[PDB]
Amino acid sequence: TLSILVAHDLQRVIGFENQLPWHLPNDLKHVKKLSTGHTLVMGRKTFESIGKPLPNRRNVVLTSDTSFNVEGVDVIHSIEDIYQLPGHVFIFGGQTLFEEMIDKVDDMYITVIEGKFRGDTFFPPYTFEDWEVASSVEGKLDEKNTIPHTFLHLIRK
Ligand SMILES: NC(=O)c1ccc[n+]([C@@H]2O[C@H](COP(=O)([O-])OP(=O)(O)OC[C@H]3O[C@@H](n4cnc5c(N)ncnc54)[C@H](OP(=O)(O)O)[C@@H]3O)[C@@H](O)[C@H]2O)c1
Numbered sequence: 001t002l003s004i005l006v007a008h009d010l011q012r013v014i015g016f017e018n019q020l021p022w023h024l025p026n027d028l029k030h031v032k033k034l035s036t037g038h039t040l041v042m043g044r045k046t047f048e049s050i051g052k053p054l055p056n057r058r059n060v061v062l063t064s065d066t067s068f069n070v071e072g073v074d075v076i077h078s079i080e081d082i083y084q085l086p087g088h089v090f091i092f093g094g095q096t097l098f099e100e101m102i103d104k105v106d107d108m109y110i111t112v113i114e115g116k117f118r119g120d121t122f123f124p125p126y127t128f129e130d131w132e133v134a135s136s137v138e139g140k141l142d143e144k145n146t147i148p149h150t151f152l153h154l155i156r157k
């Protein structure tokens with residue numbers, strides 16, 4: 001299975017200045033739970049943003065940099081390489097990867113951040129005419145998680 005994982009706001013903002021625009025611990029927990037024991041494919045900028053591979057999953061970084069060789073990280077240099085990765089593969093970001101992969105993935109696990117943030121990077125437009133809502137679950141709010149959010153699982157029709 002090839003899936004997208006993304007958090008985007010009401011206007012599809014995903015990032016600002018190479019970081020998340022929001023602080024939402026529950027989204028990180030969501031991502032950790034979904035991808036544990038599986039594979040994440042991410043662009044170079046997303047990797048550098050996180051700073052280190054995420055433990056207990058295969059971390060794959062897509063880059064043109066032939067000098068890229070980081071401990072605990074597997075490198076690929078082509079989109080085509082993604083299709084040779086075994087198991088459940090999650091497209092992890094960022095904008096460039098999402099733009100390249102949205103027409104190719106089987107499904108998407110989206111956290112809709114129900115606010116309007118300043119962004120410099122976006123998830124591409126998509127329509128529910130193409131995507132069946134497998135599930136929609138409202139995120140629970142508390143003092144650590146104060147922005148309304150909804151977890152969608154969308155499957156390509
Ligand atoms: N909200 C979310 O769900 C989420 C998740 C992840 C990231 N983000 C955000 O997304 C933003 C980053 O997105 P971005 O588009 O600027 O960067 P990105 O997608 O993370 O990385 C782009 C880089 O990936 C490499 N790349 C992409 N396609 C390639 C290809 N076909 N062949 C070879 N290399 C390829 C290139 O690296 P080289 O230049 O080294 O060749 C390119 O510069 C940040 O703000 C981050 O916080 C948000």
Ligand SMILES: Cc1cc2nc(-c3nccs3)n(-c3ccc4c(N)nc(N)nc4c3)c2cc1C
Binds near residue numbers: 005007019054
């Ligand atoms: C510990 C931890 C740190 C993280 N930092 C990020 C960043 N995303 C963008 C810049 S840094 N993220 C990410 C990365 C990619 C993500 C993605 N593709 N979808 C969703 N919904 N959340 C993400 C969150 C982290 C996730 C975890 C579990």
